[PDB]
Design a protein around this ligand. Structure first.
Ligand SMILES: *[C@@H]1O[C@H](CO)[C@@H](O[C@@H]2O[C@H](CO)[C@@H](O[C@@H]3O[C@H](CO[C@H]4O[C@H](CO)[C@@H](O)[C@H](O)[C@@H]4O)[C@@H](O)[C@H](O[C@H]4O[C@H](CO)[C@@H](O)[C@H](O)[C@@H]4O[C@@H]4O[C@H](CO)[C@@H](O)[C@H](O)[C@H]4NC(C)=O)[C@@H]3O)[C@H](O)[C@H]2NC(C)=O)[C@H](O)[C@H]1NC(C)=O
Ligand SMILES: *[C@@H]1O[C@H](CO)[C@@H](O[C@@H]2O[C@H](CO)[C@@H](O[C@@H]3O[C@H](CO[C@H]4O[C@H](CO)[C@@H](O)[C@H](O[C@H]5O[C@H](CO)[C@@H](O)[C@H](O)[C@@H]5O)[C@@H]4O)[C@@H](O)[C@H](O[C@H]4O[C@H](CO)[C@@H](O)[C@H](O)[C@@H]4O)[C@@H]3O)[C@H](O)[C@H]2NC(C)=O)[C@H](O)[C@H]1NC(C)=O
Ligand SMILES: *[C@@H]1O[C@H](CO)[C@@H](O[C@@H]2O[C@H](CO)[C@@H](O[C@@H]3O[C@H](CO)[C@@H](O)[C@H](O)[C@@H]3O)[C@H](O)[C@H]2NC(C)=O)[C@H](O)[C@H]1NC(C)=O
Ligand SMILES: *[C@@H]1O[C@H](CO)[C@@H](O[C@@H]2O[C@H](CO)[C@@H](O[C@@H]3O[C@H](CO)[C@@H](O)[C@H](O)[C@@H]3O)[C@H](O)[C@H]2NC(C)=O)[C@H](O)[C@H]1NC(C)=O
Ligand SMILES: *[C@@H]1O[C@H](CO)[C@@H](O[C@@H]2O[C@H](CO)[C@@H](O)[C@H](O)[C@H]2NC(C)=O)[C@H](O)[C@H]1NC(C)=O
Ligand code: NAG
Ligand code: NAG
Lengths: 66, 98, 320, 346, 49
């Protein structure tokens, strides 16, 4: 047994955009439009505060965030 | 016609019911952490704050099982949490440090 | 925290393409694994020549220093007929002993993973997202289709054509903080001695501390016992003990007082090193064979010795 | 029950079964991390844990920190993916909170938690909602909306086989949970299909209904033609260039990428209605049942016949009656209709 | 993605759905139909629009 839902992939078509800005195009309709490329993010880069903290003080600040 | 239903659907067989009793004691926590009489006061304030807040929004409910006071595991774990390392020594006869 | 989240969420298919095919996914995965990892190749294999190291610039124990791992202590109590020559070969008791593991005859390459030899372009004051872009540009500018750095990138010590574009030059105090780095990468051994005898400097020949040698030589090495030539016997050393002072050479080096310093050069390795970048090899190889393979392949190369270099502490992550 | 394992016994029914003995847990024992920490670092780590337990219990959720996963899975005898569904839908109740000791340096508390774990029988992932549209019929002058009463609410399709589900007694704990799920067959006029009832209802002319679909097509049902779309039968409509139809703008949709489909394909079905369905729906003034999918000609007719016969001629609305008879006769005998209509207007 | 006694690494896939508004309405009332009673040929009747 190995579950995996097709609840967001049921219709067998998909309408994709090349930029978030394209969502405001006036001759689009009322539907779901997906941005074509994934957004890749490293937490180390996002959380600046921790970078300058040291020892357990750094560790406890990350725990609160997670 | 049809539209997707993304949430799972579970068919119920039965229900299992459990009762868990959680026992908290500051003195046991203060001994392992080598705390001082000043920090013992912080530990005590901190634990009451959190427990009291929970106490203040929950009414009581009757649950149809037997009294914990009659169950071995309740008697054994309560005596332990209070008196595990407590002993009494009796001199052959009374004699003090000279 | 991560496991708890994993334990209540089933999987869902999302109708976009595989991240493994997207540039931004390949570039940020290679960076997070291999940003500061490099491979250096000697012109030919040549190890550090002596087992004893005279290095008075480092303050002795009496902050903690990394070189204290190699520091021979002078002990008052010893067994009967005990001599340094038996244990620490030709090393001077109260200085530093270099193990035979750091002096292998067949070692041809040095593999390291640290951000502590970068020239002035790198600053920890600046932002992570800047310091990424800065490196990512430099590595693109100093390469051309392979993973070999251009000679310009190296310091003047390692190459004739080096201009410190990427790496700084190793200095005198670096031995105290980063021992293995110096012992494996330095081209020549330079000494720093306030020991009475070296360079034929005699106590008369000088033309609170003031003008004085740190450790003066005694008559000979000896022990004496009282009908118990086994465990506990007094030991008389061949030189003095620096426990009382312990700041002499460090304070001398910084020039708070004048003193008869001795420095002698000894050539180890030819100044013709060659340096590869594992971050640039990850990007280039993943365009041909795909990241899943290249990642697994290059992660094993970091565990070539049996301890993975990338999990060592940042200052001590140097392996032959 | 004497053991959690006993819940999987095959000759149990659908009800609530309680484990006979309480589970006793010391936090000191549970939280290892703190044991090896020192000073305020230990104190702040416990604060984070106690504040998280409180947050879970307010939402009626279970904090699985204080119960072993291996233990629960071993006892329940379930797969990795079943456990994920079981732990997401379980709910908690706090039935007492008691302070057992209070010094200025020391405290102790007890908490009674009661858990209810739903054990699943079956899990359904790829699901569609039904939307009944129906059909218009113009009968003896009256416009009428006709609909089938389907015996299912959800269509499911995991791989290749389609399945029609009837749900009962359902709630929402993140996912939908139902006590009863019956598998049915779609409607038809045969021994191997469902014999479903058919509803009719009178409506006002002109009738227009246009629903914009999400993929960029339009669903249309209308009593009159426009942009070449036939009347009375519904249809899914798409255009190659923006145009105005039924007084609103039908836009050209954005090009899409083709993926693997899970759309259901229902069986087709012919349906014979009574000749005067429009008069039957009109004199009730509510939505009324007129046939079944699989009914005989004889039973269908002997159903509004007595009712219809007793709409007889009267001294007080002969002209208004004669005009109904014509509209009723027009398709059967057009020569007679034209005559009756004449004697009406006279 | 990696599990040593001193080191770990994880990946998370998050999917977001942002509703873009067309119009926002702030000052709103709920309708409550009350109707009217009518007494006709003996019968009391409740009438509603
Ligand atoms: C690993 O590798 C690195 C190199 O990347 C190495 O760091 C270098 O270490 C050397 C040796 O300590 C440093 O060079 C010395 O600098 C001294 C200070 O320099 C100032 O003064 C000079 C003028 O005297 C100026 O030109 C300069 O601009 C500075 O202001 C300098 O005093 C040393 O010079 C003496 O020693 C050399 C030895 O070869 C000798 O050739 C010179 O003639 C000079 O005289 C000698 O004096 C000593 C006592 O001081 C005496 O014992 C000896 O008998 C004299 N010899 C003669 C012939 O009279 C020298 O130039 C260099 O700056 C460091 N480089 C960097 C970039 O920091 C590490 O030490 C290596 N580590 C290990 C552990 O191997
Ligand atoms: C569900 O499906 C059923 C079955 O198809 C539909 O009911 C049938 O409708 C058709 C089409 O309107 C009818 O066809 C006609 O049949 C007669 C002959 O009927 C006699 O012989 C049959 C032999 O099988 C027999 O079943 C009949 O029995 C029924 O009727 C008797 C008498 O009332 C009753 O006592 C029984 O209990 C049964 O109910 C009967 O003995 C035939 O004469 C017709 O011919 C005309 O049409 C053809 C073709 O166009 C043409 O060539 C001829 O010139 C003539 O114009 C016609 O074929 C059939 O009788 C119906 N069967 C039943 C059982 O009622 C039903 O409409 C569907 N329901 C829904 C809701 O859609
Ligand atoms: C982690 O440890 C490193 C190593 O000690 C820390 O880096 C050091 O940071 C200090 C304080 O910022 C630096 O000292 C100062 O340097 C500047 C510039 O030379 C000088 O003007 C000041 O007088 C002072 O000396 C120090 O340069 C730097 N390390 C080294 C070896 O030079 C780092 O801050 C620590 N990370 C933390 C706390 O998150
Ligand atoms: C609370 O305080 C006690 C009392 O100091 C701590 O116990 C002590 O823990 C240290 C470190 O683990 C022990 O030192 C080591 O002992 C071993 C075994 O003898 C030895 O091999 C090491 O060289 C070192 O000496 C020490 O034995 C032990 N206490 C005593 C009196 O012996 C305890 O760790 C503290 N609790 C915390 C920080 O949670
Ligand atoms: C790095 O390499 C070492 C040496 O090959 C690996 O050590 C082995 O680890 C496995 C773990 O299952 C043991 O079964 C072997 O007995 C180990 N061998 C020795 C000689 O120690 C180590 O696993 C590698 N580590 C990584 C992270 O790849
Ligand atoms: C080093 O290489 C030489 C020459 O190939 C070989 O004879 C020797 O076995 C190797 N190992 C050691 C430890 O010397
Ligand atoms: C003096 O120094 C020179 C350096 O070349 C050395 O060869 C010689 O042996 C030394 N002499 C004495 C007596 O130390």
């Amino acid at each position: 047994a190995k579950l995996r839902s097709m609840g967001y992939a049921l219709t067998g078509a998909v309408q994709t955009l090349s930029q978030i800005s394209d969502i405001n195009d006036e001759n689009l309709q009322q539907g779901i439009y997906l941005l074509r490329d994934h957004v890749i993010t490293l937490m180390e880069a996002t959380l600046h505060d921790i970078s300058v903290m040291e020892g357990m003080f750094a560790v406890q600040h990350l725990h609160t965030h997670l | 016609y049809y539209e997707p239903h993304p949430e799972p659907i579970v068919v119920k067989e039965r229900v299992l019911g459990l009762s868990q009793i959680l026992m908290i004691n500051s003195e046991n926590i203060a001994n392992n952490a080598n705390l001082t009489q000043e920090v013992k006061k912080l530990l005590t304030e901190m634990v009451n704050e959190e427990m009291q807040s929970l106490s203040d929004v929950m009414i009581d409910f009757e649950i149809p099982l037997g009294d914990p006071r009659d169950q071995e595991q309740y008697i054994h774990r309560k005596c332990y949490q209070e008196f595990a390392n407590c002993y009494l020594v009796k001199y052959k006869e009374p004699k003090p440090w000279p | 925290e991560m496991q708890s989240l994993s334990d209540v969420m089933i999987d869902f298919e999302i109708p976009l393409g595989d991240p493994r095919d997207q540039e931004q996914y390949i570039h940020r995965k290679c960076y997070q694994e291999f940003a500061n990892c490099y491979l250096v190749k000697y012109k030919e294999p040549k190890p550090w020549p002596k087992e004893g190291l005279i290095a008075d610039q480092c303050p002795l124990p009496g902050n903690r220093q990394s070189i204290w791992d190699y520091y021979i202590k002078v002990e008052s109590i010893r067994p009967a007929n005990w001599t340094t020559k038996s244990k620490y070969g030709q090393a001077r008791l109260g200085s530093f002993y270099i193990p035979s593991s750091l002096r292998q005859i067949n070692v041809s390459h040095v593999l390291f993973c640290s951000d502590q030899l970068y020239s002035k372009w790198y600053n920890i004051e600046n932002t992570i997202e800047q310091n990424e872009r800065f490196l990512l540009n430099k590595l693109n500018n100093l390469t051309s289709g392979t993973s070999v750095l251009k000679k310009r990138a190296l310091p003047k010590d390692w190459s004739s054509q080096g201009k410190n574009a990427l790496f700084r030059e190793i200095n005198v105090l670096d031995i105290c903080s980063k021992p293995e780095s110096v012992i494996l990468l330095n081209t020549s051994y330079y000494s720093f001695s306030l020991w009475e005898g070296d360079c034929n400097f005699t106590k008369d020949m000088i033309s609170p501390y003031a003008c004085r040698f740190w450790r003066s030589k005694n008559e000979k090495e000896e022990t004496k016992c009282r009908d118990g030539e086994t465990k506990r016997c007094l030991y008389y050393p061949l030189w003095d003990s620096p426990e009382s002072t312990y700041d002499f050479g460090y304070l001398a080096y910084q020039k708070n007082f004048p003193s008869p310093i001795c420095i002698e050069q000894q050539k180890i390795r030819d100044q013709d090193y060659e340096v590869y970048s594992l971050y640039q090899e990850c990007k280039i190889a993943s365009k041909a064979y795909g990241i899943d393979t290249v990642l697994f392949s290059l992660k094993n190369f970091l565990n070539y010795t049996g301890t993975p270099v990338n999990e060592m502490p940042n200052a001590r992550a140097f392996v032959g | 029950l004497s053991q959690i394992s006993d819940i999987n016994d095959e000759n149990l029914q659908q009800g609530i079964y309680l484990l006979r003995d309480h589970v006793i847990t010391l936090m000191e024992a549970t939280l290892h991390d703190i044991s090896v920490m020192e000073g305020m670092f230990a104190v702040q780590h416990l604060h984070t844990h106690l504040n998280h337990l409180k947050t879970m219990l307010l939402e009626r959720r279970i904090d699985w920190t204080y119960m072993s996963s291996t233990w629960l899975q071993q006892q329940l005898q379930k797969s990795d993916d079943e456990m994920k569904v079981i732990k997401r839908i379980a709910r908690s109740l706090v039935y007492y909170v008691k302070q057992t000791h209070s010094s200025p340096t020391a405290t102790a508390w007890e908490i009674g938690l009661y858990y209810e774990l739903v054990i699943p029988k079956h899990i359904y992932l790829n699901n569609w909602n039904v939307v009944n549209i129906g059909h218009l019929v113009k009968s003896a002058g009256q416009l009428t909306h006709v609909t089938i009463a389907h015996p299912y609410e959800i269509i499911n399709k995991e791989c290749v086989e389609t399945i029609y589900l009837h749900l009962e007694d359902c709630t929402r704990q993140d996912y939908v949970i139902c006590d009863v799920v019956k598998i049915v067959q779609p409607c038809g006029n045969s021994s191997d299909t469902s014999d479903c009832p058919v509803w009719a209802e009178a409506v006002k002319e002109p009738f227009v209904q246009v629903n914009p679909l999400k993929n960029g097509s339009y669903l249309v049902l209308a009593s009159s033609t426009d942009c070449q779309i036939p009347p009375y039968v519904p249809s899914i409509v798409t255009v190659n260039e923006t145009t105005s139809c039924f007084g609103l703008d039908f836009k050209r949709p954005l090009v899409a990428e083709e993926r693997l489909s899970f759309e259901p394909r229902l069986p087709n079905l012919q349906l014979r209605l009574p000749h005067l369905v429009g008069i039957i729906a009109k004199i009730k003034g509510i939505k009324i049942e007129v046939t079944s999918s699989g009914e005989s000609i004889k039973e269908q007719i002997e159903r509004a016949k007595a009712e219809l016969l007793r709409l007889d001629i009267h001294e007080g609305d002969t002209p208004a009656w004669i005009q109904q008879l014509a509209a009723a006769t027009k398709d059967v005998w057009p020569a007679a209709a034209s005559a009756l209509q004449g004697i009406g207007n006279f």
